[PDB]
A paper describes a structure:
Glycolyl-CoA carboxylase (GCC) is a new-to-nature enzyme that catalyzes the key reaction in the tartronyl-CoA (TaCo) pathway, a synthetic photorespiration bypass that was recently designed to improve photosynthetic CO2 fixation. GCC was created from propionyl-CoA carboxylase (PCC) through five mutations. The enzyme forms an α6β6 dodecameric complex, where the β-subunits arrange in a central core of two trimeric layers, while the α-subunits sit on top of the core and face outward. The biotin cofactor that is essential to catalysis is covalently linked to a lysine residue in the BCCP domain of the α-subunit and acts as a flexible arm that transfers the carboxyl group derived from HCO3– between the active sites of the α- and β-subunits.
Numbering used by the authors:
A (entry chain G), B (entry chain J): 454 to 666
C (entry chain B), D (entry chain A): 5 to 510
E (entry chain F): 5 to 170
The structure:
Amino acid sequence: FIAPEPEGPVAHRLAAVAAAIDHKLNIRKRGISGQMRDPSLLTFQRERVVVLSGQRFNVTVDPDGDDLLVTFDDGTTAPVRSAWRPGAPVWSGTVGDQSVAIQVRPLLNGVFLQHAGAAAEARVFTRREAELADLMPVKENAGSGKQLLCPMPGLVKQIMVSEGQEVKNGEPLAIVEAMKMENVLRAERDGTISKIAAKEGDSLAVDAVILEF
Amino acid sequence: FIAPEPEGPVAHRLAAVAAAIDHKLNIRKRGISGQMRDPSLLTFQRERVVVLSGQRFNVTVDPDGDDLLVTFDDGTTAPVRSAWRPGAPVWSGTVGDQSVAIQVRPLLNGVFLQHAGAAAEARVFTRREAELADLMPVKENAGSGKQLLCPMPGLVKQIMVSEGQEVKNGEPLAIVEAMKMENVLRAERDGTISKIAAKEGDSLAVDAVILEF
Amino acid sequence: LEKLEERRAQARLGGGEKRLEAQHKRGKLTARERIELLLDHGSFEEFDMFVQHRSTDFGMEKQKIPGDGVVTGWGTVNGRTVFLFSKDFTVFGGSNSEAHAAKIVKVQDMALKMRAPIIGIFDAGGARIQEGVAALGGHGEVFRRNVAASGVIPQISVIMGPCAGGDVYSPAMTDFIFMVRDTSYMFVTGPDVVKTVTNEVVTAEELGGAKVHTSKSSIADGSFENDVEAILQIRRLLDFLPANNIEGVPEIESFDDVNRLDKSLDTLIPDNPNKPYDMGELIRRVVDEGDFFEIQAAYARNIITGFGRVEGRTVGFVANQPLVLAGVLDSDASRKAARFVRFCNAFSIPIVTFVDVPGFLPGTAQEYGGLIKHGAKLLFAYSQATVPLVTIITRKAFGGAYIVMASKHVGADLNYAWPTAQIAVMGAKGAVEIIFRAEIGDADKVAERTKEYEDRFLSPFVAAERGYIDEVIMPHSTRKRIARALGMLRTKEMEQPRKKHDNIPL
Amino acid sequence: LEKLEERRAQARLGGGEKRLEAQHKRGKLTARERIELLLDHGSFEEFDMFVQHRSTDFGMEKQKIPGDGVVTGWGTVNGRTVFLFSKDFTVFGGSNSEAHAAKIVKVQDMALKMRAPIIGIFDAGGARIQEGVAALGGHGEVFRRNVAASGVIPQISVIMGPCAGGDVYSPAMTDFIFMVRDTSYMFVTGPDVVKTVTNEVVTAEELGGAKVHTSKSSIADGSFENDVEAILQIRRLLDFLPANNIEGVPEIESFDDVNRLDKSLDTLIPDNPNKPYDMGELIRRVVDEGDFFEIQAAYARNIITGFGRVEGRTVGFVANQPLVLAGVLDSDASRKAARFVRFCNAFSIPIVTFVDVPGFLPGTAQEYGGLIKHGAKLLFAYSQATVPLVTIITRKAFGGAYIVMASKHVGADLNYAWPTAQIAVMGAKGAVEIIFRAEIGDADKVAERTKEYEDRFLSPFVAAERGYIDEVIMPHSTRKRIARALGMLRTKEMEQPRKKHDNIPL
Amino acid sequence: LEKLEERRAQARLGGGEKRLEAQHKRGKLTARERIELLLDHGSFEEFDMFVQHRSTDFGMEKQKIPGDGVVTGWGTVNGRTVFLFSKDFTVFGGSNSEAHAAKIVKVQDMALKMRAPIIGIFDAGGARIQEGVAALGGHGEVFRRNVAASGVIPQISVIMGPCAGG
Ligand SMILES: CC(C)(COP(=O)(O)OP(=O)(O)OC[C@H]1O[C@@H](n2cnc3c(N)ncnc32)[C@H](O)[C@@H]1OP(=O)(O)O)[C@@H](O)C(=O)NCCC(=O)NCCS
Ligand SMILES: CC(C)(COP(=O)(O)OP(=O)(O)OC[C@H]1O[C@@H](n2cnc3c(N)ncnc32)[C@H](O)[C@@H]1OP(=O)(O)O)[C@@H](O)C(=O)NCCC(=O)NCCS
Ligand SMILES: CC(C)(COP(=O)(O)OP(=O)(O)OC[C@H]1O[C@@H](n2cnc3c(N)ncnc32)[C@H](O)[C@@H]1OP(=O)(O)O)[C@@H](O)C(=O)NCCC(=O)NCCS
Ligand SMILES: *C(=O)CCCC[C@@H]1SC[C@@H]2NC(=O)N[C@@H]21
Ligand SMILES: *C(=O)CCCC[C@@H]1SC[C@@H]2NC(=O)N[C@@H]21
């Protein structure tokens, strides 16, 4: 139904994995060419803040040779070992003692992690970056109207939904043929189909009414 | 009412003046810089064709010291002396024996001449150029739809005409104020004002009806 | 010797007597007649007269017409070397092919190598369908050479017939496009495909006629009544332009006087600030002999661009037109003036700017159309110019419009102002509304402050005290000051920083 | 020593604690907080911290705030030198003035002289009315330096607040404009003047909001949820871009492998010719690690532009999107791709092009909007490019659209084609109709000839036999071929003929 | 049109009739007379005639003289283009200021851009004390222009009065 937010050891493992991924990415990033002076003449901030879908973890990351060590506020240390590389959809490795596999989906300034039935957006900041990010407002979605319009002119070819059917997001609703190419329309909201304006074989202009939520 | 087309001696004088103006312009033009070789190594075609509003004159232009000598088909010669320079609205000089003054206005590939109550468009070609120009069709204007549309949004300032009044071409009809600037509309046809749709002070829109011819 | 002349005559016949007489019946000249009219008498030398196509698909090998639908060569216009190609509508409909494009490529290469103007005359029907992708390859070669020649030699396109499909993209990259009314049209997609796709019924004239491209789409720089008039005007235009980007503008003997005064200009500006005036009148008063070749006269008529002469040398002119849209700057005028200024700068043509502009056109239509970048185009063109820039402010110069219209801050060399100039951030009313926003409810106090602001700031002297205006001149001395300034500025040397090219917004 | 630190703290306070709290109340950061977030820790050096205005009109001398509404300086982003200025909304509303523009001019001069990127953060209210024409002069100086720096150093504008009047023209001539949703807007003319003139009631968001400029007007290259996300993405983009037009693209160590094959690409193209596919999937499967920074993602979605990495080096990508408008080329897509290609060529960024385009968008709306010149802009940009160009045709390449989309004929270095590519003048049906218009009435004959034309010409092999396609490659080796081609083409040397600049249509 | 002529005449008067008379009493020409003698007849075009200082310290705002103590422009000497500036001793003693140095910098930039000789006529009293370090900044800009133009265009300085300090 709705993906649970990670809790307890699952949350700690996700935070450690996110911190390790961020550390690896930062180490790779610091080796960019064209820098003003030698990158080695610079320090890396140990203190990191891992925001795990509205849950903060104050962690410190220290590389243990070929491994990484993540220490939390309560004193728990979770060594992280993996051969994961950016672009791999699955993060496989050991977080402390347990061997885990985590789905990694990148997003803006972070990654999206799924593990043990829990899903959370992971963003790793410094102290000051976390403080500045806390000032940003929480913006709510404006939703959408109950009418499914036709973005482009064309001919309706197929509609898979009927009257009085309940569908959710990410489901096809109609196919519009324009310039010898199909166009699949997907639901932007949820609601039982109350009235269908257009059927198969009907030529519709721009912004024509197709479905009523 | 309608400007008469030149006839007889007036037409001959207008043709001679047009030929002299064309000769002066060509002589000045041949002095342009950047030519491939010396312009003195080129020849000027004596034979010329002067078209005065659908009337052709086959003339030959020969320099005589400072002035020109224009010889027509029927043996007649007309020396042309003037101090006129391009940009001067009036051509003053002697064409043969008579001293004449001719109004000169700019025209596309020619000049517009007025003299002795006669007006004609003067174009001077070579024989081959005249032959090629004779192939061009005569295109007739269509006209307006007896309605004065407002080309820009604004507010009507003043209307100087009433219904059932005769207006000639170019007579102002209404003033439209837009962005702190007056706009004057002029009639594109002739007739009587059937009725007035927009009154002074009304805030019209784009392509709004003002009056019907 | 007689067989060679017989073959020459057969090649000159083109597609046959019937097709030539059909072409003449439509009121159009043939390609060779157009070439003969454009060039000086006896100066035309033709290239590749006997070139034939090598296609063997769909029975094309049974009809081999020499020239392959185009006449190429070189000649002189008023004694100056030019190159030209004229597409023959009677030979396969003028359609582009492999050998057709090869001939055009040869003439383009020679024009670029010799640093001479190249003239394109277009009367065709697109690319030859039977040829296949070879015609597309030849079109691509022509396009690449058009891009290479851009900014080096002037490229003039004369549309004297149909121009559809990939044909239109060759003139679009040239400096100037001229069309003949009622016989020429341009569009990427033809009316048949428009009907089959958009279910819209239009004719060729409605879709891409001369009026459409001269007043709506900004494609064409002008239109002419017929072929003879168009060709004679092309000959006239060639006398204004430099042969390349090195030799500079051509010079002729001027019949006008550079020291003459025009007292009528002292009363050109109306007393009423809401009364417009004709800026073209001022332009034709300033240029030599009143001779002015206007560019894009029917498009974006709130600004004026064109070529004139001062002391016998070509000068570009950009001027706001108060008669149209109060002389404001919108997207169309900005793009038109930007293209003109870029062309003048590329070929070392000095630019004289007359400024009377109250600001930019408001509304959601301008903002949704990208007025920001479109105005930035003109600003970029003016700031990028290294040619002499003489600016004369006549009535108004408000804010960003003042900055854009060749101000001293963007690199103008000399900035004159008439006594009626008003250089300020905005009008007095809006200025006092913004400044004295607390005491907005009053009426007499607001009027008094508005009068004070008008007397103190809406004048050319606040900018003069800051050095932004070099001199406040009498209107009757405009031509004299411009001529002396251009004579002094002929020796200007200036360069932009090294780069492959700039990133002007598109 | 203590008085200096006290003065520094007072200057850092800006317009006061109350105004800073009001700024934080709207969910926006302050100028100094934005600078701190953008740069590396402790790398910021500030210029002109104590600069004050010298205006004495309308009681301005009683309000002297150090900094004059802008924070300027330099720092490092990921160890690389950058320059930046951030307008302070709490100091006179961030409005431009003489000293404000002087500070911006100093930072611009230093950025151009050091050949380093310059970042502009815009949260202001236009130009200061009380300053008068001096603010306009400073704006003009800033505009001139923006034009001078164009094509030499990358210029990035981040709109994090209001931007109205003459302010908008400085970001407009920069390379990239990024906006923050729901808190930033751009327009030349404000809503009040729009209501006064056009009698139209709009808000700031409706007139110039982030959605308007990211999806409708082509002004902005992207929008972000809030300030922190925008600044982090700016850091990412800076890591993507070269420092100037000399050093070349930055290089990092890549975790991806250049010899890996992607078998899923063998089934990307649907069997049905009318079924669209996502070209973004191909782009993200070709780039390193699937990391792709898209440019103008919300505008003209029938084409895709953005930055990726191949073997750790920045590569530009242009690709038709079959999911939107069947992947056709229109004015918006042409202008977007042309600007992207011009930027990539100006800074020596190689471009990889994926081609699937059936032609151009037909209709009177495109022709009246100037589709000829807008389409020619992309062709001009591609033919002008001297950076490596690798083109891969996946499904379709028809007519002039094939020529425009970086064909071999316009200067592309390597042109690959998938086995499903169809390179022809047009579709089989229309080609048969044009060629065999005499016998169009016979249905079976028409079908037979259409099948013959489909078998003969709608394949990548007619172009391969003519040498227009270098190789027909298997879809699963696309990344390997691209990587090897770019590695080989890194040493490409090519130059356009000498000129001030080209005359690309505007 | 008549008010423009009146303003031009008032600007040409410089620092007053009596100061011009004292200048003639010393056997010295005025700046405008020197410019008129140097250039060809009718060839002088003046720049920044109405430029005024923006100083507000020590009561300087109560005396704003157009030109700010220097006359700049261009002309022809024997038909050849030259640029020149002549310091007006009757206006604040000819002392350099921010706008004074701005006018000199403009004329120097134009002379260098047009590749023409530039002539300097010096009759002044150093830098304006009330114009703080802004006067020094303008002096530095003039010095930078002088160094940049060295070896490119001929620079001629005519000392026809006091010249002290910077
Ligand atoms: C340009 C055009 C509007 C003008 O056609 P037109 O002015 O009415 O003249 P026609 O249609 O009678 O064609 C004239 C001749 O030229 C030939 N022709 C024109 N264009 C041709 C082309 N691209 N390839 C081959 N032949 C062509 C025709 O076969 C015809 O031969 P015909 O006289 O024996 O009949 C039309 O020919 C056209 O659209 N052609 C295709 C160009 C194109 O690509 N349009 C965009 C569609 S996506
Ligand atoms: C940009 C703009 C839409 C945003 O205004 P805003 O977001 O609602 O914020 P405000 O209107 O309350 O102005 C904020 C402060 O900055 C000041 N300010 C804003 N712009 C200014 C300017 N151009 N000059 C001087 N001060 C300015 C205001 O006086 C105000 O001071 P306050 O806080 O004591 O009231 C609006 O200020 C504006 O349009 N300014 C003029 C810019 C312009 O040229 N617009 C085009 C009109 S043609
Ligand atoms: C150059 C100088 C020797 C000539 O002075 P002078 O020829 O005797 O003429 P004056 O001294 O009467 O000064 C003339 C006027 O110009 C003004 N003036 C001269 N130099 C000035 C300066 N540098 N700043 C401001 N005002 C100045 C004086 O106030 C005086 O006004 P006044 O006519 O009402 O009295 C002298 O003015 C001087 O030395 N000035 C300072 C320049 C300098 O730096 N010298 C080196 C000292 S370290
Ligand atoms: C009176 O109505 C004043 C408002 C009109 C001002 C005009 S409209 C076009 C120009 N743009 C702008 O901002 N002001 C000018
Ligand atoms: C079937 O309807 C064929 C006509 C559609 C062809 C498509 S529309 C957009 C492309 N442009 C063009 O000329 N042909 C393509």
